[PDB]
Short mmCIF file of C-alpha atoms in Angstrom, two decimals:
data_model
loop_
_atom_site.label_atom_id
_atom_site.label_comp_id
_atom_site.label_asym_id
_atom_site.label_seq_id
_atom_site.Cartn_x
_atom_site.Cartn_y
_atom_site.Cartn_z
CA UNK A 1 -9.51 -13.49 0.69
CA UNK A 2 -12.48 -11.19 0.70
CA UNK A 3 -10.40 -9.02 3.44
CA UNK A 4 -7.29 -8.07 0.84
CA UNK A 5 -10.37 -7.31 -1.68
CA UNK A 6 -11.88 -4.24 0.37
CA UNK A 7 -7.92 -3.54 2.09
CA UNK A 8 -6.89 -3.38 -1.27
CA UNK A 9 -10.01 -2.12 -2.98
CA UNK A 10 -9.26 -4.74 -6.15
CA UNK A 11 -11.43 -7.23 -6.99
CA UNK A 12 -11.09 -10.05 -9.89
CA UNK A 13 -14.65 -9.59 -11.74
CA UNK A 14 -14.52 -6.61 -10.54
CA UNK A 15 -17.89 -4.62 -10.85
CA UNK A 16 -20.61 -4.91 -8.74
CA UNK A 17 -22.08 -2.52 -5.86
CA UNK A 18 -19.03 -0.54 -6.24
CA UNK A 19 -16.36 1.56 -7.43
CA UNK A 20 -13.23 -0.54 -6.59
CA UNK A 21 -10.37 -0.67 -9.13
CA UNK A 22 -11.04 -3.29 -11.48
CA UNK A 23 -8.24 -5.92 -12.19
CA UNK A 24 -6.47 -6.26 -15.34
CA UNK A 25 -5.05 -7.33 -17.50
CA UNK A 26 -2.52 -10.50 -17.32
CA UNK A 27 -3.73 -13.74 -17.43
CA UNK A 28 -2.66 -15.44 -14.18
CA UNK A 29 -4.15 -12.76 -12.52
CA UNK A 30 -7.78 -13.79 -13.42
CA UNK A 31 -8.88 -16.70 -11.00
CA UNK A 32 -11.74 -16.13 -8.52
CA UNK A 33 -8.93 -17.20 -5.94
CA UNK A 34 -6.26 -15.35 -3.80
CA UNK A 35 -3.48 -15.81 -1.16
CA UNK A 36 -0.38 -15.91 0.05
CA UNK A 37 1.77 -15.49 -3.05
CA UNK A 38 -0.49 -12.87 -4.48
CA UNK A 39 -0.37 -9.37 -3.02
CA UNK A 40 3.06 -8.41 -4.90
CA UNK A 41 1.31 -9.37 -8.29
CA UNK A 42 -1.45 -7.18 -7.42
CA UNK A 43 0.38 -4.00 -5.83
CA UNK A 44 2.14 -4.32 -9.18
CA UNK A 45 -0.98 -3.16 -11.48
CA UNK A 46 -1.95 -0.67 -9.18
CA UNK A 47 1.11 1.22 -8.39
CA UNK A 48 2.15 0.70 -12.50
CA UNK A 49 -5.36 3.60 -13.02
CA UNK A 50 -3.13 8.99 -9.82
CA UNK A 51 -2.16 9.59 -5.71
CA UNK A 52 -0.13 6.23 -5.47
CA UNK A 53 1.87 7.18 -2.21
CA UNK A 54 -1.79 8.40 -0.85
CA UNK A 55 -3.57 5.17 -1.68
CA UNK A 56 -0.82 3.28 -0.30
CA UNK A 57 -0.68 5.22 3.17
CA UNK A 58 -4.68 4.20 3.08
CA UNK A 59 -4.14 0.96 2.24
CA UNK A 60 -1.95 0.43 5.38
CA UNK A 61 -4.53 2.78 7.31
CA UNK A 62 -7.30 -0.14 6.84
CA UNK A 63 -4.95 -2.99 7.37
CA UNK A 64 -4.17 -1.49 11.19
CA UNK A 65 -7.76 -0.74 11.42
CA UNK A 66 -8.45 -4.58 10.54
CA UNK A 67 -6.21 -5.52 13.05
CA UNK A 68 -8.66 -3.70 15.63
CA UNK A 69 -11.56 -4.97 13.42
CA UNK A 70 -10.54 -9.06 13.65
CA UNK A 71 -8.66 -8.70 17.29
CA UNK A 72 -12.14 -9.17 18.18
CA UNK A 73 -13.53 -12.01 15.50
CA UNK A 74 -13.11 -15.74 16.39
CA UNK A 75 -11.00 -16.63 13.31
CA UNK A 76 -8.29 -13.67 13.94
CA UNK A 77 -5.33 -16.41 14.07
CA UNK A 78 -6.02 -17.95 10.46
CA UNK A 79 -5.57 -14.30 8.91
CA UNK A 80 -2.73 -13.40 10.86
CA UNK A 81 -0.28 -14.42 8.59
CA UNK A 82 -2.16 -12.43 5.97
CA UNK A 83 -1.74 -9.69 7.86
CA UNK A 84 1.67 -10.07 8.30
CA UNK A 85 2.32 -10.24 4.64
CA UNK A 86 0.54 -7.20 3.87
CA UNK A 87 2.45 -5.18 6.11
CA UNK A 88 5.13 -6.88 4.43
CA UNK A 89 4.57 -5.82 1.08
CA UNK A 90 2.32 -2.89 1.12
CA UNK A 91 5.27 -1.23 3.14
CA UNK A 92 7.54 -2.78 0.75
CA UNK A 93 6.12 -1.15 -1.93
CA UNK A 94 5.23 1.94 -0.35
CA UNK A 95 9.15 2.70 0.62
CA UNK A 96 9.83 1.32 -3.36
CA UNK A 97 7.22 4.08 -4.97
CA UNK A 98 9.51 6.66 -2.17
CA UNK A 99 12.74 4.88 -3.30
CA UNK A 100 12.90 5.95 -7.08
CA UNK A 101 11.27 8.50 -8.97
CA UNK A 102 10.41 6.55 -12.19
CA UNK A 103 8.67 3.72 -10.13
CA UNK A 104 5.28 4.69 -9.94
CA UNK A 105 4.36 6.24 -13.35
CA UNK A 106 1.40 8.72 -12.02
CA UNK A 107 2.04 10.66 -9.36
CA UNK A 108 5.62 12.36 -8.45
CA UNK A 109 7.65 12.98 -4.95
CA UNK A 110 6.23 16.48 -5.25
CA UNK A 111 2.71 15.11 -5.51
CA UNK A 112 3.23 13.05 -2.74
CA UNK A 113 4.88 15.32 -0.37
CA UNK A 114 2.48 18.27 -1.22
CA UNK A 115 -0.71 16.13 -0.11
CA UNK A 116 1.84 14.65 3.32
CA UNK A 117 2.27 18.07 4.43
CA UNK A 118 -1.29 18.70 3.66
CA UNK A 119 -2.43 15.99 5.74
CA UNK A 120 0.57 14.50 8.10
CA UNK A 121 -1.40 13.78 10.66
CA UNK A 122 -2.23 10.81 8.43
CA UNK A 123 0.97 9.91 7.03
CA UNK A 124 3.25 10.52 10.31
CA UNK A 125 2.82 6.83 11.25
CA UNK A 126 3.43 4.71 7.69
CA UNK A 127 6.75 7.15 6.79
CA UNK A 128 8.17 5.58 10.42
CA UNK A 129 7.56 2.22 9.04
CA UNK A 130 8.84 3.42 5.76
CA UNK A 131 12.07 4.52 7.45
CA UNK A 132 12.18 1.13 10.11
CA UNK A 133 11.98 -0.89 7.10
CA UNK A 134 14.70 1.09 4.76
CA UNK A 135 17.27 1.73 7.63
CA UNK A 136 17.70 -2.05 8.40
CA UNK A 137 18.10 -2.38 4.13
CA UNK A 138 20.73 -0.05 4.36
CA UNK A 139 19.26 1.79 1.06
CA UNK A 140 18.22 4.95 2.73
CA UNK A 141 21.12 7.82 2.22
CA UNK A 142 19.98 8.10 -1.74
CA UNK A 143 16.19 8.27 0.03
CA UNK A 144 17.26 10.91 2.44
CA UNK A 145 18.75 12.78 -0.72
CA UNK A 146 15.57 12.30 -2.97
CA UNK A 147 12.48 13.62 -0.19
CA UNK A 148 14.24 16.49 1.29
CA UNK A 149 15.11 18.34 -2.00
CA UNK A 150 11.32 17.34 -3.10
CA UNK A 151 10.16 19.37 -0.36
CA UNK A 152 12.51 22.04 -0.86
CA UNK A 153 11.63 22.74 -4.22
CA UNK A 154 8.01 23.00 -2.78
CA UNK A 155 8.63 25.13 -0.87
CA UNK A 156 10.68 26.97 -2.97
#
């Protein structure tokens, strides 16, 4: 539970000892309890707080370095499926704020691309999953005409 709190950097409450996003506003999502069937409602506040393609790529950075982190913990086989479902989802989501441009409502494709070319060496491993995940969908041609132009008119 406590591990998709600092992956995520949401907390119910929230505030205490830190600066992570505080949770609001709906109703359900108010319970001191989380799981399973609770990461999409959460990635749905904080993609719809101004990088969202940035915090996302970080997001997935500390979920693989968790997986280095709790290879080596005792009770690495009851969060495995948690695991699993966040690089479900967070990739999910990731490809879906990369799939339209009116998805996430702060931050553009040129916002995003301008900080991936400033710092690929970051991003160079979550775009593959991006494109592993979209290719299989079949929902990538649109995708491949949406980035490329971004970049373009960056450059340009």
């Amino acid at each position: 539970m406590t591990a998709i709190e600092d992956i995520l950097q949401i907390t119910t409450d929230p505030s205490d000892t830190r600066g992570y996003s505080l949770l609001k506003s709906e109703e359900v999502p108010q319970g001191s309890t989380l799981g399973v069937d609770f990461i999409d409602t959460l990635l749905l506040y904080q993609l719809t707080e101004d990088k969202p393609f940035e915090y996302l790529n970080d997001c997935f950075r500390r979920n693989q370095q968790q997986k280095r982190i709790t290879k080596n913990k005792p009770n690495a086989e009851s969060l495995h499926s948690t695991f699993q479902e966040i690089d479900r989802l967070v990739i999910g989501y990731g490809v879906v704020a990369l799939q339209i441009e009116n998805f996430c409502m702060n931050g553009a494709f040129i916002n995003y691309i301008t900080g991936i070319v400033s710092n690929v060496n970051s991003y160079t491993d979550f775009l593959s999953q991006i494109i592993q995940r979209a290719i299989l969908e079949g929902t990538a041609l649109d995708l491949l005409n949406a980035v490329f132009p971004t970049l373009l008119e960056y450059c340009n």
